[PDB]
Design a protein around this ligand. Structure first.
Ligand SMILES: CC[C@@H](Oc1cccc(CN(CCCOc2ccc(OC)cc2)c2nc3ccccc3o2)c1)C(=O)O
Length: 262
């Protein structure tokens, strides 16, 4: 039954996420338009996000346009994660408020975990796999926008070195969502039992799928803690940008996620 549960989780991930590691690797293997400088950013925008640059002199600064594009992907991924969570045994049986709380704290940890699948050491896929933005270009942006993506590349290079596949990532994302220590949960006991169940599925799956790496489960527990810290730091940077960059608006769904988070 635990093998069946692992497969159900994987099937739910394949249905619900537009991007996965298989799809990303096909693309990254060599088509995506390469964004490596301001000229190619602007060319890519004209083809792939035309509306955002159809304002002439009224267009926002390039860094702010990138900030906006990043948030759009997060909004869509939050929708995918909310539908995915229904496949987790017990999740749909929880009080609606607890569902909201688990998603509030888990979505960005899951986002940064899955973001790793579209990253290599030189850059990352964007716009549903139709662009590839270089790591060096993102580092070249004016402060503080150059500080957004680099810590996520750093996380991703080490996470990708574990050589997880989608079957593993689906269970890891389910485990992220099930954390029983999120602030403000009502039914901690039922959430802890839901978490115990999914973590048991994850541990057995990693044992079967990665017999060569006897420590992969505790490695991933540590990655979960690393992701929590990465999200805490990211939220702090987002708040700095919101307060100091008059054009860098935050989408209302994301402002609700960030509100009172850390
Ligand atoms: C800034 C505040 C914002 O921070 C971030 C920080 C890091 C990553 C994201 C979301 N993200 C990057 C999208 C870039 O999207 C474009 C699109 C077009 C473009 O130029 C034409 C440039 C960038 C992403 N990709 C994914 C791929 C797979 C799985 C999950 C994914 O998550 C948001 C937040 O907090 O929401």
């Amino acid at each position: 039954d635990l093998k069946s549960l692992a497969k159900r989780i994987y099937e739910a991930y394949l249905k619900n996420f537009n991007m996965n590691k298989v799809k990303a690797r096909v693309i990254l293997s060599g088509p995506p338009f390469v964004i490596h400088d301001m000229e190619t950013l602007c060319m890519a925008e004209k083809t792939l996000v035309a509306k955002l640059v159809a304002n002439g002199i009224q267009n926002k600064e390039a860094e702010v346009r990138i900030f906006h594009c990043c948030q759009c992907t997060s909004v869509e991924t939050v929708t995918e994660l909310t539908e995915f969570a229904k496949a987790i045994p017990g999740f749909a049986n929880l009080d609606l408020n607890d569902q909201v709380t688990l998603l509030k704290y888990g979505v960005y940890e899951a986002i940064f975990a899955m973001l790793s699948s579209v990253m290599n050491k030189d850059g990352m896929l964007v716009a549903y796999g139709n662009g590839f933005i270089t790591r060096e270009f993102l580092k070249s942006l004016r402060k503080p926008f150059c500080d957004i993506m680099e810590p996520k590349f750093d996380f991703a290079m080490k996470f990708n070195a574990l050589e997880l596949d989608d079957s593993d990532i689906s269970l890891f994302v389910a485990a992220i969502i099930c954390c029983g220590d999120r602030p403000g949960l009502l039914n901690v006991g039922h959430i802890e039992k839901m978490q115990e169940g999914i973590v048991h599925v994850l541990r057995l799956h990693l044992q079967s799928n990665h017999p060569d790496d006897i420590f992969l489960f505790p490695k991933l527990l540590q990655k979960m803690a690393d992701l929590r810290q990465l999200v805490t730091e990211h939220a702090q940077l987002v708040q700095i940008i919101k307060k100091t960059e008059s054009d860098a608006a935050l989408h209302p769904l994301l402002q609700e996620i960030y509100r009172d988070m850390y």
